[PDB]
Unconditional design. Structure first.
Lengths: 50, 25
């Protein structure tokens, strides 16, 4: 029932929808939207579970 | 054609209020 409310359908369209929430007002690109999702939880330097 | 991509953004913005975003745009 959550997949009905999802406006995205693929991966690159979904990475834009995180950019429009995290950095709103700035138009997103391909390589700028890919590096933002990686830098949230999947980088050693900007995430630590300790 | 890099100005029609702003009209794809400007009517659909997340209402930015930071002037550094508006200048770098």
């Amino acid at each position: 029932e959550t997949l009905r409310v999802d406006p995205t359908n693929d991966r690159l369209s979904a990475l834009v929808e995180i950019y429009r929430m995290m950095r709103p007002g700035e138009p997103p690109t391909r390589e700028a939207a890919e590096s933002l999702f990686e830098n949230l939880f999947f980088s050693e330097d900007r995430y630590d579970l300790s | 054609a890099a100005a029609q991509v702003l009209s794809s953004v400007e009517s659909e913005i997340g209402r930015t209020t930071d002037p550094v975003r508006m200048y770098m745009r």
